[PDB]
C-alpha cells in the first residue's frame, strides 16, 4: 500500500478503467529496470503494485500508458503516455498515491506523500 | 492591457477562439456588476478588456462561458461556466494574464502576473 | 454521499485540511440561496454535505474557500476562493465528486460523476 | 519555429525563467538521442530549438528540470523532471507549443497544435 496510482477521465468525468501502468526503477548503471506493473481498476486505482520490503529508496519512473488509453475510445491523443518521475523514501518509508487527470491533448499529474 | 484573458482547449489541442468572457467587478453592496466583456480571439487571447485608469484595486470576477463553448463543437460539458474571482492590488507595475485550460468535465486556471 | 468535495495541496503534497465548502443553489428568483456547507477532513474530503432527498435537480455552487486556506500556512495567493459552477440531477440522480488541486496562483478542478 | 515550450510557475504566478529544457528524438535501437535543449527566457518560453528541415516526423521527448528550479527559490520539489512524450506528426503545417504548469508536488502539460 506504499504506492497507488489513480487515474481520472477528464471527458467523460469518471474513472479511467484498464489503464496500463509500468514502474521502473533506476538500477547502478543508470538503466531504467522494471520494477512493477498492472492496470487500474473500475475505480481508476490500482493498488498491490509493490510492499514495503521491495519499495526501497530509489528513483522511479511511472510510465501510465494514456494512448492505448485514448485510442480504444477512438480519440487521437497528442502524448504517447504520462510519465512521472521522483525520488522515493529518501528520508525512509512514506506512502505515496500518483494521480494523473487525462484529457487528450494534455494531463495533470500530482503525488499524495504521507508518513 | 492591465489585464488579458487565455483560454486553451485540452481536448483538440488549440486555442478556444469565439469564447465569451465577462468580468464584474464587486460594488460596496457586495453585488456583482458587469465590468468588460468580450470573445476570444483566433489565438484564444482576449486582450484590451481595460485600461490601466479603469481597473483599480478591488476584487474581481472573470466568467469564461465553457458550457457554450462545448455546446458548440457537440461535447457534453460538466460545468456552466469558469469563474476567477481574485483581488487585484497595486504593488508596483502589474499585468495579470488570467488563463484557462478547458476539459469538458475539469479546468485549471493560472493567473502570471508581471511588471 | 450524492456529494463530496476533495481538495489537495499541490505546494506540501497532501490533503487540504480544515478548508471551508460553501454550497449554494439557484433559486427561482435567480439568486444563490445557502445549501449546505462544511470543512475537509484530514483526509482532505468532505462527506455529508446533503441527502439524495435534498439534493434534488438545480444549478449549484460549490465555493471553496482557498484564500483562507493559504492564508493560515503564510502564503498570499492570488484567488479569494475556487468556485464550481455544474447543473446537477437533470437526468436523474448521480454521485458527484468535486475534487480541487491547490497551488498559490492556481488551481485545477475535476468531477467524477457515476451512477 | 515548429517546436516551442513555455513553462510557469503556479506558486509565485509568473514565468518560470532559466529552465533547462531537454528535447530528444526517439532512435531506432530505442534509444533516446539529443535533439535541442536550451533554458527558457525571461517570458518563461524557449524559442528556436528547431527548424522545420530537422523536426521530422517521429517519437520526441521534451524533458524540463523542474527540480532545479525548485531547489534554486528554496521550495522541496516531488518530481525529478516533467517529461512530455509524443509523436509528431504531418498533416499539413503545424506548430507545436508544449507548456507546462508547475507547482511543487503536480504539474500540469498540455500541447497547442496550430497551423
Ligand atoms: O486526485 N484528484 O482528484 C485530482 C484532482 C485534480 C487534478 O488536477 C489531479 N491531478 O493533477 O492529478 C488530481
Ligand atoms: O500556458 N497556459 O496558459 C497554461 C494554463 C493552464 C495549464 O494547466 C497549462 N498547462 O497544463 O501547461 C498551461
Request: proline share 5%; glycine share 6%; with cysteine.
Amino acid at each position: 500500500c506504499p504506492l497507488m496510482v489513480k487515474v481520472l477521465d477528464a471527458v467523460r468525468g469518471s474513472p479511467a478503467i484498464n489503464v496500463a501502468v509500468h514502474v521502473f526503477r533506476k538500477a547502478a548503471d543508470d538503466t531504467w529496470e522494471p520494477f512493477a506493473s498492472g492496470k487500474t481498476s473500475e475505480s481508476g486505482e490500482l493498488h498491490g503494485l509493490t510492499t514495503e520490503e521491495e519499495f526501497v529508496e530509489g528513483i522511479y519512473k511511472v510510465e501510465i500508458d494514456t494512448k492505448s488509453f485514448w485510442k480504444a475510445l477512438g480519440i487521437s491523443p497528442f502524448h504517447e503516455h504520462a510519465e512521472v518521475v521522483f525520488t522515493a523514501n529518501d528520508s525512509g518509508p512514506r506512502r505515496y498515491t500518483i494521480a494523473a487527470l487525462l484529457s487528450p491533448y494534455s494531463y495533470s499529474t500530482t503525488a499524495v506523500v504521507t508518513n
